[PDB]
C-alpha cells in the first residue's frame, strides 16, 4: 500500500494553491491538482480515503479573504470538489476527525477570534455547530486520540496560550486539561501512541524548536527531543509510527525542510525537503493517486 | 510581518 503525505496550500509571498504529495518509501514528490482557491492557515484531514482542505485565508496582493470553504480531493481522479461550507470563515483553523466526522475548531474571521466548533458529516454533506471551546483560539493545534478531541495552545485575541482542552463527544462538553510547559501559538499538534504532541509554534518571543507530549492517562506534559529547525505555522502528520513536520516560518525564511521524529530513539532527522519553502500548509495522509 | 506565520501585514 502506497500512502503519501499530502501538503495543500501554504504561503510564500502570497497564499498558495499547491497540492503536492511526498512518498516516504522512495523520497519522491508529485505535484497534483491545484486548489481551486489559494489558501494558507488551512488544515487538512482524511476521511474515507478522501483528502479535505478546511478553512484558511487567501492572503493575496489585492486583499485578505478568510475562508469557510471545505474542499475535497479524490486521489483516484486527481480532482477537487467543493463541499458544504462552514458556518463561518476560519483562518488558522484546527481540524480533527472522530469516527468519520470532521471537526473544525476555532480560527479567525477578520479581527474575530472563534471559540466556536462545528462538525461535518461527509455522506450527508452537512455542517452543524457543536459545543464551543472554553477558550477562543486561533493558530490552535488539534488532534484526536481514543475518540476524544484535543485543542492545544493558540491565541485568544490578547495572549498566546499554553492552555489546552479536550472535547468529549457523548457529552458535547469541553474540559480544560493540564496546560503545556510552553506557550505555543501556531504549533503542529498530532497524536503518536498514547500521547498528544505539540511541536514548534511561537511563544511570543521566538519561533520554537521544542516539542512536548501529553500523556492522556497521566495528564502530564513532557519534553522530548527538539526539532533541528525552529518553526511556527508548520504542517504536521503521523505516518507509520513517526511524526513528520513540514515547512513553517523560523523568523528568517520559509522552510522547505521536512523532519521526521522517531519515538523509539527520541531523535529527529531531515528526510526530505519540499519543492519550495512555505508556511501555513494543510497536511494529511492517504492513498497515492491514479 | 506576522512572526507566527511569516505572512505580510
From Swiss-Prot, chain A:
<feature type="site" description="Sensor for electrophilic agents">
    <location>
        <position position="111"/>
    </location>
</feature>
<comment type="similarity">
    <text>Belongs to the KEAP1 family.</text>
</comment>
<feature type="repeat" description="Kelch 2">
    <location>
        <begin position="50"/>
        <end position="100"/>
    </location>
</feature>
<comment type="subunit">
    <text>Component of the BCR(KEAP1) E3 ubiquitin ligase complex, at least composed of 2 molecules of CUL3, 2 molecules of KEAP1, and RBX1. Interacts with NFE2L2/NRF2; the interaction is direct. Forms a ternary complex with NFE2L2/NRF2 and PGAM5. Interacts with (phosphorylated) SQSTM1/p62; the interaction is direct and inactivates the BCR(KEAP1) complex by sequestering it in inclusion bodies, promoting its degradation. Interacts with NFE2L1. Interacts with BPTF and PTMA. Interacts with MAP1LC3B. Interacts indirectly with ENC1. Interacts with SESN1 and SESN2. Interacts with HSP90AA1 and HSP90AB1.</text>
</comment>
<feature type="repeat" description="Kelch 5">
    <location>
        <begin position="196"/>
        <end position="241"/>
    </location>
</feature>
<feature type="repeat" description="Kelch 1">
    <location>
        <begin position="4"/>
        <end position="49"/>
    </location>
</feature>
<feature type="modified residue" description="S-cGMP-cysteine">
    <location>
        <position position="111"/>
    </location>
</feature>
<protein>
    <recommendedName>
        <fullName>Kelch-like ECH-associated protein 1</fullName>
    </recommendedName>
</protein>
<feature type="repeat" description="Kelch 6">
    <location>
        <begin position="242"/>
        <end position="288"/>
    </location>
</feature>
<comment type="function">
    <text>Substrate-specific adapter of a BCR (BTB-CUL3-RBX1) E3 ubiquitin ligase complex that regulates the response to oxidative stress by targeting NFE2L2/NRF2 for ubiquitination. KEAP1 acts as a key sensor of oxidative and electrophilic stress: in normal conditions, the BCR(KEAP1) complex mediates ubiquitination and degradation of NFE2L2/NRF2, a transcription factor regulating expression of many cytoprotective genes.</text>
</comment>
<feature type="repeat" description="Kelch 4">
    <location>
        <begin position="148"/>
        <end position="194"/>
    </location>
</feature>
<feature type="repeat" description="Kelch 3">
    <location>
        <begin position="101"/>
        <end position="147"/>
    </location>
</feature>
<feature type="modified residue" description="S-(2-succinyl)cysteine">
    <location>
        <position position="290"/>
    </location>
</feature>
UniProtKB/Swiss-Prot annotation, chain B:
<comment type="function">
    <text>Transcription factor that plays a key role in the response to oxidative stress: binds to antioxidant response (ARE) elements present in the promoter region of many cytoprotective genes, such as phase 2 detoxifying enzymes, and promotes their expression, thereby neutralizing reactive electrophiles. In normal conditions, ubiquitinated and degraded in the cytoplasm by the BCR(KEAP1) complex.</text>
</comment>
<comment type="subunit">
    <text>Heterodimer; heterodimerizes with small Maf proteins. Interacts (via the bZIP domain) with MAFG and MAFK; required for binding to antioxidant response elements (AREs) on DNA. Interacts with KEAP1; the interaction is direct and promotes ubiquitination by the BCR(KEAP1) E3 ubiquitin ligase complex. Forms a ternary complex with PGAM5 and KEAP1. Interacts with EEF1D at heat shock promoter elements (HSE). Interacts via its leucine-zipper domain with the coiled-coil domain of PMF1. Interacts with CHD6; involved in activation of the transcription.</text>
</comment>
<feature type="short sequence motif" description="ETGE motif">
    <location>
        <begin position="4"/>
        <end position="7"/>
    </location>
</feature>
<comment type="similarity">
    <text>Belongs to the bZIP family. CNC subfamily.</text>
</comment>
<protein>
    <recommendedName>
        <fullName>Nuclear factor erythroid 2-related factor 2</fullName>
    </recommendedName>
</protein>
Amino acid at each position: 500500500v502506497g500512502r503519501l503525505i499530502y501538503t495543500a496550500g501554504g504561503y510564500f509571498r502570497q497564499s498558495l494553491s499547491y497540492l503536492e504529495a511526498y512518498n516516504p518509501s522512495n523520497g519522491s514528490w508529485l505535484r497534483l491538482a491545484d486548489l481551486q482557491v489559494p489558501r494558507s492557515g488551512l488544515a487538512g484531514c482524511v476521511v474515507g480515503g478522501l483528502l479535505y482542505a478546511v478553512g484558511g485565508r487567501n492572503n493575496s496582493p489585492d486583499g485578505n479573504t478568510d475562508s469557510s470553504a471545505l474542499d475535497c480531493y479524490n486521489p483516484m481522479t486527481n480532482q477537487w470538489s467543493p463541499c458544504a461550507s462552514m458556518s463561518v470563515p476560519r483562518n488558522r483553523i484546527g481540524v480533527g476527525v472522530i469516527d468519520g466526522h470532521i471537526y473544525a475548531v476555532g480560527g479567525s474571521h477578520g479581527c474575530i477570534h472563534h471559540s466556536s466548533v462545528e462538525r461535518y458529516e461527509p455522506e450527508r454533506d452537512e455542517w452543524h455547530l457543536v459545543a464551543p471551546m472554553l477558550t477562543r483560539r486561533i493558530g490552535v493545534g488539534v488532534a484526536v486520540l481514543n475518540r476524544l478531541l484535543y485543542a492545544v495552545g493558540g491565541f485568544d485575541g490578547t495572549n498566546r496560550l499554553n492552555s489546552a482542552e479536550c472535547y468529549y463527544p457523548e457529552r458535547n462538553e469541553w474540559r480544560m486539561i493540564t496546560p503545556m510547559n510552553t506557550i505555543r501559538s501556531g504549533a503542529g499538534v498530532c497524536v503518536l501512541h498514547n500521547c498528544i504532541y505539540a511541536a514548534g509554534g511561537y511563544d511570543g518571543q521566538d519561533q520554537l524548536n521544542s516539542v512536548e507530549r501529553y500523556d492522556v492517562e497521566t495528564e502530564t506534559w513532557t519534553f522530548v527531543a527538539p526539532m533541528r529547525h525552529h518553526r511556527s505555522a508548520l504542517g504536521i502528520t503521523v505516518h507509520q509510527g513517526k511524526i513528520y513536520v513540514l515547512g513553517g516560518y523560523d523568523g528568517h525564511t520559509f522552510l522547505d525542510s521536512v523532519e521526521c521524529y522517531d519515538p523509539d530513539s527520541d531523535t529527529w532527522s531531515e528526510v526530505t525537503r519540499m519543492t519550495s519553502g512555505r508556511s501555513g500548509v494543510g497536511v494529511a495522509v492517504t492513498m497515492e493517486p491514479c | 510581518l506576522d512572526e507566527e506565520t511569516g505572512e505580510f501585514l
